[PDB]
C-alpha cells in the first residue's frame, strides 16, 4: 500500500532532477521533491520520493538503501 519514500544523507550538490532520475531507475516515479532550506535555499540533503505503485517503492528500498553517494551513504525508506 505505502508509495511514499524519505531518502536521506544526499550530496549538498545533489538536484531535484538527478534525484528523480536515480529513483526513476527502477520504476514510474510519480513525485520527487528536493527538501531545501527556504531562507538561502541550499539543499537540506533529504527529499521525498512517491512511487506510482507500492511493489516499486519496495524495489528502490530494497536496491537503492545504503548506496554511498560521493563522500555518504544514502537511507531510503517510508515516509
Same mark, same amino acid.
Given at each position: 500500500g505505502r508509495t511514499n519514500l524519505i531518502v536521506n544523507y !544526499?550530496?549538498?550538490?545533489?538536484?531535484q532532477d538527478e534525484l528523480r532520475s536515480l529513483f526513476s531507475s527502477i520504476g514510474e516515479v510519480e513525485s520527487a521533491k528536493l527538501i531545501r532550506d527556504?531562507?538561502?535555499?541550499?539543499? !537540506?540533503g533529504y527529499g521525498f520520493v512517491n512511487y506510482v505503485t507500492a511493489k516499486d517503492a519496495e524495489r528502490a528500498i530494497n536496491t537503492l538503501n545504503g548506496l554511498r553517494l560521493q563522500s555518504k551513504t544514502i537511507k531510503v525508506s517510508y515516509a
Open positions: !544526499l550530496p549538498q550538490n545533489m538536484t527556504k531562507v538561502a535555499g541550499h539543499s !537540506l
